Amino acid sequence: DLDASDYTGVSFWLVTAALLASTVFFFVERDRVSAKWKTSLTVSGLVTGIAFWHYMYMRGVWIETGDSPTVFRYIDWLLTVPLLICEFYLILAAATNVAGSLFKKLLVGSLVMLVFGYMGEAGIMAAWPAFIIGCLAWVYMIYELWAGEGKSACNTASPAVQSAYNTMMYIIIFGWAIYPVGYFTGYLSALNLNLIYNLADFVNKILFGLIIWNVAVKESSNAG
Template structure:
């Protein structure tokens, strides 16, 4: 049994390592620029990509520690950080090679990872109660409105203020659902104390942590400052927001999963 567990863990680490090694080689093959010691934006891309890799391995390995009903939640947390790590290699390469904001890669990343983060609210509630499918779909709609509005504004398809307004409306809709909507009511009425605590921390990350993104958008596109300085500020703010919102979000889920599992054993 112990040998099987060790073998399973080794297989997870090997699979993640092989995937990321392939991605890294592909990213390096795309360009030959070298990261400069004074390129703090590029350095932030590298630091965060390494943190995301470490988080991915951690979440996948910790699946063996929690009960069956929490394994999907930890798997999704690992997928969020894995997808983000892959995209961060490519975003770093775009930045170091061209000096341009990797808007397309960033939004492809967000279009995959942000819905997965929203699914986590549904998953942790589903682990302790029967949750209507409408909760899932309302969170998805709010997420897509937020991301599509932001992308259209950043990519120049819409006026930047209009894109900003649409994105903020989607975010507000998500906040309503998790603070006053059906998801919030299920959490308050049916969840045990540990799940309620995790749910509350997660929604405050969506409130405070996600507030960093519109700050980045505002600094990058709406302040009218020098384009080069705006790009630097935009990417540093977005990168810091990603490391908080993706890794910390998963750690909260890991903590409640371990707590619930250990309580059930007593």
């Protein structure tokens, strides 16, 4: 039985279980969605599925060592963040006709936020400059959602899709903002940084995928 002194150990176990439940939920709930939205729910399951597969290894590292598994942490982000950006393309493709140029601009900004974030936690370029650079890439992320191809594409979509797109954008706004909070807490320690990161994937990976499922089911029921 798990300890009750270290909240981080509880979070590693709690989150890991939630990502396993979410992965099964997303892959199974593709029956309720139309063939256009089936790809959107698959990518959500992959994000939670990869994150769960990465959290199992990270949970062992915490018990065996007690230090933050930074290398395992950022490798998972390097694989799941592009798939989350793909969700913006998929919903605008399963509802409207979008070429997808906004995908490239968001993907480049996301990679910059992750590449510099890993370097700061590894001692490269100290930590304060990394926090500023990671923030600026996050600032570029929010700007392209206010004005871009997606904003033009979201205008012609159904009101249900528009509400989802705004909610997903908010998640980029508030949810992705909590990562710099954990970065600030853990370097400006390790126990709180891992706790915040654990809770972050609860929102940015599970709540993000639940918004996709809700809009897909509403649209699919309309068609039947």
